Design a protein around this ligand. Structure first.
Ligand SMILES: [Ca+2]
Length: 123
């Protein structure tokens, strides 16, 4: 599902604020890593990243592959590809507690300035 900044801002209402990561920061990060596509999959060196939040199958979700996952979120990766972000957010929170926003930023400067540009209208 290709989401919009506005529908996504509504669906992320329970994520915004967790570990002090704001809503506009999340909209910025997600646009950059998945283009708001719940079905995004990016293949990396020794793993794949799934869904809107690009959760990897090395440590976080178990993919329907031959990859041995630590599966911290205790979730199959296919559940991170549908239009229900409920479980995705559950996992995102686990990652925030473990790795922090650093999991997404990866020491890069993206989404650091003019974040107010990312609001839907109000929030
Ligand atoms: Ca889901």
């Amino acid at each position: 599902k290709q989401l919009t900044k506005c529908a996504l801002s509504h669906e992320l209402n329970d994520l915004a604020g967790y570990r002090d990561i704001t809503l506009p920061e999340w909209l910025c990060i997600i646009f950059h890593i998945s283009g708001y596509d719940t079905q995004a999959i990016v293949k990396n060196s020794d793993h794949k990243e799934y869904g809107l939040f690009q959760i990897n199958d090395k440590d976080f979700c178990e993919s329907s592959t031959t990859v041995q996952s630590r599966n911290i979120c205790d979730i199959s990766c296919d559940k991170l590809l549908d239009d229900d972000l409920t479980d995705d957010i559950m996992c995102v929170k686990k990652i925030l507690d473990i790795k922090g926003i650093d999991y997404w930023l990866a020491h890069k400067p993206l989404c650091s300035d003019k974040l107010e540009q990312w609001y839907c209208e109000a929030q």
